[PDB]
Structure formats: structure tokens, C-alpha cells
């Protein structure tokens, strides 16, 4: 019962993540930052423009298969 989320970076690159509806999104943020080789707190992760918290889950955010997460530099970063 995974959904696949597409994570889009500042440079238009994509990394997809298969997650459960109950997965704490901290797991995704940490993995993504690791693969980019930057500290996790230098980034902010947005779903439809709203900030994804470590303890948010896809269910709480109303996410579904194929949904996009955008990654921006943290604004006081961070």
C-alpha cells in the first residue's frame, strides 16, 4: 500500500520515494538531503506550497500516488 511521491529540487531534478500513508515524512526529508549531500535543515520541503513537518504523514496531508513535493532552500537556513 505504498504511494510514490516525486520530490523536485531547485534545479528541476527528481527523486521518487515509495512511502506508506503512515510514514513520518522526516524519513523522506532525511533521505533526500543525504542524497543531495546537504544538511537536512538547509532545506524546506513543501506540498502545495505548505511546509512539511517531520511528523506529518502522507495521510495527514491528503497526499496520493504521483503527488509532488518541492524542495527549496530554507529561508533562514536553517
Amino acid at each position: 500500500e505504498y504511494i510514490k511521491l516525486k520530490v523536485i529540487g531547485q534545479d528541476s531534478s527528481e527523486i521518487h520515494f515509495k512511502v506508506k500513508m503512515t510514514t513520518h515524512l522526516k524519513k523522506l526529508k532525511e533521505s533526500y538531503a543525504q542524497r543531495q549531500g546537504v544538511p537536512m535543515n538547509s532545506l524546506r520541503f513543501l506540498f502545495e506550497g505548505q511546509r512539511i513537518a517531520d511528523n506529518h504523514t502522507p495521510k495527514e496531508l491528503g497526499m496520493e500516488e504521483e503527488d509532488v513535493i518541492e524542495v527549496y532552500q530554507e529561508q533562514t537556513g536553517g
Binding site: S13, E14, H16, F17, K18, K20, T23, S31, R35
Partner: peptide, 12 residues
């Protein structure tokens, strides 16, 4: 440069 390959990470 070329198109990146597909990248899927499973968070189990």
C-alpha cells in the same frame, strides 16, 4: 547534459 535516469527509493 543528458536526461537523468529514474530514481526510486523505498522507505520501508
Amino acid at each position: 547534459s543528458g536526461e537523468a535516469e529514474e530514481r526510486i527509493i523505498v522507505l520501508s
